[PDB]
Amino acid sequence: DKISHKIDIPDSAWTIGIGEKFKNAGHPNVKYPMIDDSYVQGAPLGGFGAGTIGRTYNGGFSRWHLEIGKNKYTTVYANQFSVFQKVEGNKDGVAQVLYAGEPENGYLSSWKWDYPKESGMYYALYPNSWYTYTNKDLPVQLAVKQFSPIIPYNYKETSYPVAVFKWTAYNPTNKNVDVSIMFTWQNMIGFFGKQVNVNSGNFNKIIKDKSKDSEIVAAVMGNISNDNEEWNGEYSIGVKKVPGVDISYKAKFVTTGDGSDLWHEFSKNGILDNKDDETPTKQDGIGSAIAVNFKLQPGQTIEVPFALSWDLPIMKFGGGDKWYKMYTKYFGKNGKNSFAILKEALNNYQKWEKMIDDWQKPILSNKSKPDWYKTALFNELYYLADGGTAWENGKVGEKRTNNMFGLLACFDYNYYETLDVRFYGSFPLVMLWPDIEKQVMRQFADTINVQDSSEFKVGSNGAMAVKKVQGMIPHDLGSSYALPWIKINAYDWQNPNIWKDLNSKYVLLVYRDYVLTGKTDKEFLKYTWKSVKTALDKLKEMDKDNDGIPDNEGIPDQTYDTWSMKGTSAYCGSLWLAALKAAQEIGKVLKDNEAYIKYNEWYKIAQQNFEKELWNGEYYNFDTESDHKDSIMADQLAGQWYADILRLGDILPKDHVQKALKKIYEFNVMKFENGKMGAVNGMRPDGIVDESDIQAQEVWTGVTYALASFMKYRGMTEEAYNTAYGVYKMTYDKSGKGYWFRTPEAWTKDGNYRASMYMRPLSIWSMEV
Numbered sequence: 182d183k184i185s186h187k188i189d190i191p192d193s194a195w196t197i198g199i200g201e202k203f204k205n206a207g208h209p210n211v212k213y214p215m216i217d218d219s220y221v222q223g224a225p226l227g228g229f230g231a232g233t234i235g236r237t238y239n240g241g242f243s244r245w246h247l248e249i250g251k252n253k254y255t256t257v258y259a260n261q262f263s264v265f266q267k268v269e270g271n272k273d274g275v276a277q278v279l280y281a282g283e284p285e286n287g288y289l290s291s292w293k294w295d296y297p298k299e300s301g302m303y304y305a306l307y308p309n310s311w312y313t314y315t316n317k318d319l320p321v322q323l324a325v326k327q328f329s330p331i332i333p334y335n336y337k338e339t340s341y342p343v344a345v346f347k348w349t350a351y352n353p354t355n356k357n358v359d360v361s362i363m364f365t366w367q368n369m370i371g372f373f374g375k376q377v378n379v380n381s382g383n384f385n386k387i388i389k390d391k392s393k394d395s396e397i398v399a400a401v402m403g404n405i406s407n408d409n410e411e412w413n414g415e416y417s418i419g420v421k422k423v424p425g426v427d428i429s430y431k432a433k434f435v436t437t438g439d440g441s442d443l444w445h446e447f448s449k450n451g452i453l454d455n456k457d458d459e460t461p462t463k464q465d466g467i468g469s470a471i472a473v474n475f476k477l478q479p480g481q482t483i484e485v486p487f488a489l490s491w492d493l494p495i496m497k498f499g500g501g502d503k504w505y506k507m508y509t510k511y512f513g514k515n516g517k518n519s520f521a522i523l524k525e526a527l528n529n530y531q532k533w534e535k536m537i538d539d540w541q542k543p544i545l546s547n548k549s550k551p552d553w554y555k556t557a558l559f560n561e562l563y564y565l566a567d568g569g570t571a572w573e574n575g576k577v578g579e580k581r582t583n584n585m586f587g588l589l590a591c592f593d594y595n596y597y598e599t600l601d602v603r604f605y606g607s608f609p610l611v612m613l614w615p616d617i618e619k620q621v622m623r624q625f626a627d628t629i630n631v632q633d634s635s636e637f638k639v640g641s642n643g644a645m646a647v648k649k650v651q652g653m654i655p656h657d658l659g660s661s662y663a664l665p666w667i668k669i670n671a672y673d674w675q676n677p678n679i680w681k682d683l684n685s686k687y688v689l690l691v692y693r694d695y696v697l698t699g700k701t702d703k704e705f706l707k708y709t710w711k712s713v714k715t716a717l718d719k720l721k722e723m724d725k726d727n728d729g730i731p732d733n734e735g736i737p738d739q740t741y742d743t744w745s746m747k748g749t750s751a752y753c754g755s756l757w758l759a760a761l762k763a764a765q766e767i768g769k770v771l772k773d774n775e776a777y778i779k780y781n782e783w784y785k786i787a788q789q790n791f792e793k794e795l796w797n798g799e800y801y802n803f804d805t806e807s808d809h810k811d812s813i814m815a816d817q818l819a820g821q822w823y824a825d826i827l828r829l830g831d832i833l834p835k836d837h838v839q840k841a842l843k844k845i846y847e848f849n850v851m852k853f854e855n856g857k858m859g860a861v862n863g864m865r866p867d868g869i870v871d872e873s874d875i876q877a878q879e880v881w882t883g884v885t886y887a888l889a890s891f892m893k894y895r896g897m898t899e900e901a902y903n904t905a906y907g908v909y910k911m912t913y914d915k916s917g918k919g920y921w922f923r924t925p926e927a928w929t930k931d932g933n934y935r936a937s938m939y940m941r942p943l944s945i946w947s948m949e950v
């Protein structure tokens with residue numbers, strides 16, 4: 182490996198060998214079918230709301246999130262980078278696809294597949310990833326840096342459906358070597374969203390943009406139809422000319438054939454035919470190829486940028502609504518703009534790299550923090566792009582000031598903006614994209630007084646319940662299979678209109694968003710104030726026994742939606758206390774004296790009774806009425822955790838909080854698989870895991886990262902990082918379960934998982950407050 186010295190990969194990048202087999206991988210531990218796409222994954226490409234493409238560590242473009250809200254795992258074999266090298270003096274050169282695998286059938290059989298093991302590495306520090314190719318049959322060493330311009334406090338480039346592939350080639354040998362790099366791409370119009378004739382009308386064109394000190398050559402892969410539909414648009418691949426490289430292309434090769442139409446050209450001398458051909462296809466799949474060829478002398482390095490764009494302007498959801506994607510603000514809505522997007526990236530990628538470095542530098546340069554923590558902190562952010570992210574720029578046929586946004590809980594539970602989860606998972610948005618965060622919270626504010634009296638069947642018990650009750654915050658803002666933002670509460674396993682955490686979490690999120698953006702946005706507090714008061718007032722009515730605290734009803738009426746709580750719970754009780762204190766403070770800011778007095782009065786009574794009912798001398802009991810009410814819950818003081826972040830002070834005595842956190846570390850962490858796997862949710866005071874429900878026996882990744890942040894703020898530094906380390910280890914390490922770029926909600930002691938690709942572990946960013 183002589184190429185690593187020519188590029189700048191951070192030491193905290195996650196690494197794996199190209200073609201590496203992983204032996205230890207976990208699988209779903211539930212009864213019904215659940216997504217398991219394997220450990221062959223990578224950092225995604227694509228902006229927020231753009232649709233994303235997962236290119237794996239083996240080199241394949243395999244995890245397709247271009248249909249917004251859906252996860253489709255299948256390698257499109259035509260989509261590759263390939264290399265040709267010939268040493269000066271030799272008769273023949275060698276050509277190789279940079280993919281550690283091969284197609285299942287006979288398509289593209291002429292290409293040289295099966296990139297060999299121990300010949301290259303993949304590296305990732307989101308939004309960047311890299312591949313190095315250090316192969317004993319490739320005298321010139323190559324590396325690529327690939328990324329999309331995901332930039333905090335930037336809502337423009339962050340939206341773009343584009344990726345840059347910045348190649349570096351170096352000759353360490355004593356002979357001249359001819360080198361070509363080729364990007365191939367299938368015309369994927371019709372890959373989704375087209376019910377019949379999936380390739381029909383697809384056609385490819387070549388664009389040559391020549392103007393003083395820029396030459397770009399690109400393929401635009403589109404359809405002859407000018408229809409405005411989810412399926413129609415364009416893909417583009419291309420390259421910018423640099424001194425010492427020549428560009429060649431092939432506009433049309435058949436992907437549903439042996440591929441020798443292209444490969445016979447590339448494999449001979451690394452130079453393509455430059456054959457333009459706009460003939461549309463009928464049944465056959467088609468693709469394009471863009472290549473560069475250059476000669477490297479001994480000791481010479483060259484850099485060359487390629488790019489990929491996709492202009493698929495319309496997202497359709499299963500309920501029938503069609504929306505424009507956010508990036509259409511910047512490039513237009515007609516779906517004929519892929520070249521414009523590509524060109525912007527090829528002309529500005531160096532600026533974007535510097536913008537990414539500028540935001541990553543404060544953390545990366547802090548030598549007090551271990552590299553493993555940096556690996557997790559950056560790579561967990563993959564989910565902001567990969568979580569079915571929807572970001573609208575108008576309904577098709579519709580103009581508004583704001584652009585609605587939604588992130589899925591996950592793909593197995595296909596619900597946008599699950600509020601009980603976003604309480605944990607929205608930290609990166611408030612910290613790094615706060616205009617999105619506040620928009621999402623205004624979306625929730627707008628739903629508070631929505632009433633939908635139609636009934637639905639509750640999954641857990643078969644009973645009928647009202648869809649949406651006035652004054653109750655919704656569980657979610659809909660499903661990609663139905664109508665995001667329009668039909669809320671798509672979730673039906675429990676009835677969220679009786680949940681005891683949603684209304685409090687909503688208030689806490691509101692105040693959080695004010696505090697973490699500088700305590701200046703009075704207008705945001707003004708917008709949300711009626712909903713906050715309504716939310717707390719409704720929750721107060723659920724106090725059955727007049728102790729000033731809502732009563733859990735002996736069912737799973739909160740985020741642990743199979744783990745029953747009864748009476749006063751530490752979890753919902755502490756959240757309530759903190760929400761009351763937040764509402765007091767909002768009341769002061771907005772000069773709503775009567776609200777300040779009321780919520781102050783409620784807070785004092787509830788605080789007194791919470792402490793009396795639950796404090797046992799060592800920790801706070803799980804609740805007051807359940808069978809295992811004396812279980813030690815990892816999340817028992819979630820309200821105090823948020824109170825620390827919101828600078829609301831002590832809602833419970835400092836000494837008792839410290840005792841409880843030490844107990845959690847001692848039991849839920851250290852007595853669960855030697856503290857190497859996070860914090861198990863429920864442990865009995867005898868040090869055996871609570872078996873009353875599956876959720877008690879799970880580590881929740883987002884709960885554990887949040888608990889680490891709580892420990893850290895409370896000065897328990899070693900405990901904090903040791904607790905978080907188990908989550909990092911399970912997710913990224915060779916000794917873990919292979920969950921990189923698909924961090925799940927939960928795992929059990931065997932390491933097997935529930936619900937990969939989950940929002941909650943974005944809570945790691947609470948460790949940076």
Ligand SMILES: [Ca+2]
Pocket residue numbers: 723724725726727728729730731732748749
């Ligand atoms: Ca009560």
